[PDB]
Design a protein around this nucleic acid. Structure first.
Ligand SMILES: CSCC[C@H](NC=O)C(=O)O
Ligand SMILES: [Mg+2]
Lengths: 164, 88, 82
RNA sequence: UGAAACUCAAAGGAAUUGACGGGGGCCCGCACAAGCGGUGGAGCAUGUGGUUUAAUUCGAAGCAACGCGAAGAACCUUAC
RNA sequence: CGCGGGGUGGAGCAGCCUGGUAGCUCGUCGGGCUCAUAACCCGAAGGUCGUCGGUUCAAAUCCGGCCCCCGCAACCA
């Protein structure tokens, strides 16, 4: 994420590639520098150890800033775990659903688990009833990656945003 | 309790699967087990899920009338050969 | 790096055995524990079974291998690959 | 307001001796800092771990095992 | 077959989009740190970008085939 800028280039004759992708050829360093000055945007040596040192005529600092911004954007993207009960209270469930929706809106995945105990008779059924219902409620923000899946003491599902 | 010959299985990119079969032996009920055979190896083994004829949803298919039947989890569609149904 | 003053070392176990078998022409499998002994051309042609510490391993002997001690042709340690 | 079944041969308090604290204070050590020179990077020399082997004799285990018992393994030593 | 989108160190993801510039987290390997394990910190390895190819001075990037994945696609009796 660092390259030689305009006057930092000592390597004789440089490959004068613009900000667009246009070749001027193998100009002298000084000439290239002059050109850069004329056009405002700096001479960024993006490949010094190459066939003519690759001088990209862009504003180095500006470019770096742009890259940073892009990285930041990429960063903000997470998996958020909502953990339901088996014998479910309704208000709580609603709240959880709302939370999930919010997460989806933000851009985050939602891992929806249901905390099981022993008693594996109507537990999986209960889980199915819950998770599926939740999905039905919020199908327009999220599509299902992982279906109602058994983990032994859990039932997991994955709600992933409709469009990223 | 029946030997059936496959006429038209159905490829839906929407609905499902329906196997039109001509009876040769006895009767095909709704809760009977099914073996599907080709010329050499057996295609699929399982059960009958759904039963619905042209007229009405007839319970038992006697003599040799053509009846569609939905076959539990049928994997190979459009024109089979021999369906053999066994029951004690 | 070869190591001897004068009179190259052969042990009188096979040294005096192989010279008797110079009169019977050749012979078949001479198992000796002597690996200390250097090759003299009297042995050239014969079959010397040399002691690995376990196996009397057979060596069909040629004129080329003369400036060598017997135990070089008896690989005592086995394998390396893991 | 208020059990019992069941269960444990304890649950407890106060102090005491210590040990302990990302409690306090008073101290100290090349402990850090300040400084020099290294090790880790390279090659080899060793000792180990591991893995191979017919066997790689056995021990030593964080400092306080690891250029150690070994202050001298070609055979001997040597135990495998 | 239709159309849409995708295919990237082992896993999940950016970059393509703007023709030169391959990152991030989890794992794997090695070390350190600890009494010891995790966690931590460090390095180290690891991708030719599904592929056939073209392009062009130069393609993960532009184009197409094929392979796929994914979603939708009107017929069950
Ligand atoms: C032989 S096709 C079978 C189809 C079925 N019966 C009549 O139409 C319905
Ligand atoms: Mg660790």
């Amino acid at each position: 994420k660092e390259y030689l800028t305009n006057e930092r280039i000592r390597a004789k004759q440089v490959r004068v590639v613009g900000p667009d992708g246009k070749q001027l050829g193998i100009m002298d360093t000084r000439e290239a520098l002059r050109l850069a000055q004329e056009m405002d945007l700096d001479l960024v040596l993006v490949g010094p150890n190459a066939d003519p040192p690759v001088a990209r005529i862009m504003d180095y600092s500006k470019w770096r800033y742009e890259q940073q911004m892009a990285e930041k954007e990429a960063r903000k993207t997470e998996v958020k775990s909502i953990k339901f009960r088996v014998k479910i209270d309704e208000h709580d469930y609603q709240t959880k659903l709302g939370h999930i929706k919010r997460f989806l809106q933000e851009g985050h995945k939602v891992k929806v688990t249901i905390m099981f105990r022993g008693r594996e008779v109507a537990h999986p059924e209960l889980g199915e009833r819950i998770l599926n219902r939740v999905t039905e409620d919020l199908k327009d923000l999220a599509v299902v990656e992982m279906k109602p899946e058994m983990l032994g003491r859990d039932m997991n599902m994955l709600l992933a945003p409709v469009k990223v | 309790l029946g030997q059936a010959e496959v006429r038209a299985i159905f490829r839906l990119p929407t609905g499902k699967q329906v196997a039109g079969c001509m009876v040769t032996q006895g009767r095909i009920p709704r809760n009977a087990e099914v073996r599907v055979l080709r010329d050499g190896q057996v295609i699929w083994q399982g059960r009958i899920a759904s039963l619905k004829r042209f007229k009405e949803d007839v319970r038992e298919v006697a003599q040799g009338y053509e009846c569609g039947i939905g076959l539990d989890g049928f994997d190979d569609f459009r024109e089979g050969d021999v369906i053999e149904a066994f029951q004690m | 790096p070869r190591s001897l003053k004068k009179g190259v070392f052969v042990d009188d176990h096979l040294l005096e055995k192989v010279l008797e078998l110079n009169a019977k022409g050749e012979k078949r499998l001479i198992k000796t524990w002597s690996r200390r002994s250097t090759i003299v051309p009297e042995m050239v042609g014969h079959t010397i079974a040399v002691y690995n510490g376990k196996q009397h391993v057979p060596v069909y002997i040629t004129e080329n291998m003369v400036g060598h001690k017997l135990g070089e042709f008896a690989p005592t340690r086995t394998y390396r690959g893991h």
